[PDB]
Amino acid sequence: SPMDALCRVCHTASPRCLPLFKPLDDPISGKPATLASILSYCSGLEILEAELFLPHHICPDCVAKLRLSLEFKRSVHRMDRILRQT
Amino acid sequence: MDALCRVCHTASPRCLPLFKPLDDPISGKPATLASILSYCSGLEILEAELFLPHHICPDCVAKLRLSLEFKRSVHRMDRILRQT
Ligand SMILES: [Zn+2]
Ligand SMILES: [Zn+2]
């Protein structure tokens, strides 16, 4: 239970929750992607490290739904660009 | 030629119409596949743009349903977290 962190999406306590604010890439222009910037992209919510009293992690099942959401949103945008000659 | 999917551009004789009213599958409230797609993607899916596809294939509708369930779950938890 001290072994556990709470998921920002479903509030489950899991010892395998992943940190929302850890960089997943090291890009040369601009800030790294994080699970929080992907969650914000998919959900439209502000997911900000500065709100220190909210959950800062995401459980493996919610990360799985997030990955599908991201692929879907990116596919909708990619097609929209192609269709608009963008 | 079969109808083209707005999301993946497959031509399918089983594509579904974006602009026909149905009940939102989470809220039960009036919606269309276009208003749900717009809500999940952040793009305007408007019938008046007559040069763009007006249909969506059953595979992309399945991904859309998962996307909507996920977005609504994130928002429901946010309300609980910020709840009076
Ligand atoms: Zn979760
Ligand atoms: Zn499709």
Side-chain angles (χ1 to χ4, degrees), chain A residues 1-27 30 32-66 68-70 72-85, chain B:
Chain A
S1 179
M3 313 252 27
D4 292 346
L6 297 180
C7 179
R8 185 49 167 269
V9 176
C10 73
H11 227 219
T12 194
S14 168
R16 275 166 300 280
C17 275
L18 284 180
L20 277 171
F21 306 103
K22 181 132 189 305
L24 303 165
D25 45 31
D26 174 289
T34 60
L35 291 173
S37 69
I38 295 165
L39 183 56
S40 297
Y41 175 79
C42 295
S43 72
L45 289 184
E46 295 295 354
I47 306 287
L48 291 168
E49 187 178 7
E51 292 196 275
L52 305 172
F53 299 134
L54 297 180
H56 274 203
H57 296 81
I58 185 176
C59 75
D61 199 65
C62 293
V63 174
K65 299 178 175 186
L66 182 64
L68 292 170
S69 181
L70 172 67
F72 182 69
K73 188 169 161 162
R74 289 171 158 161
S75 80
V76 176
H77 283 274
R78 199 158 57 233
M79 191 63 236
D80 188 66
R81 280 197 284 289
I82 288 151
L83 289 167
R84 304 178 178 275
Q85 107 208 309
Chain B
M1 153 117 68
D2 293 322
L4 295 166
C5 180
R6 182 56 167 261
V7 176
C8 75
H9 219 60
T10 193
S12 172
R14 296 182 272 124
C15 274
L16 294 141
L18 279 169
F19 305 103
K20 178 181 150 55
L22 36 63
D23 299 346
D24 183 285
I26 310 310
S27 70
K29 280 183 196 323
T32 59
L33 296 179
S35 72
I36 297 163
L37 180 61
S38 299
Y39 176 66
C40 294
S41 71
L43 296 179
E44 290 285 9
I45 309 287
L46 289 170
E47 186 166 7
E49 285 194 284
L50 298 177
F51 286 96
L52 301 176
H54 280 193
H55 297 80
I56 180 175
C57 79
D59 285 344
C60 292
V61 168
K63 297 180 168 147
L64 179 65
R65 199 180 162 130
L66 293 173
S67 278
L68 176 64
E69 302 164 26
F70 182 66
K71 179 167 181 182
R72 292 312 303 143
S73 297
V74 173
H75 283 255
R76 171 200 164 252
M77 189 62 234
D78 188 68
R79 181 245 306 148
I80 289 149
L81 287 166
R82 301 179 185 283
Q83 110 198 316
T84 206

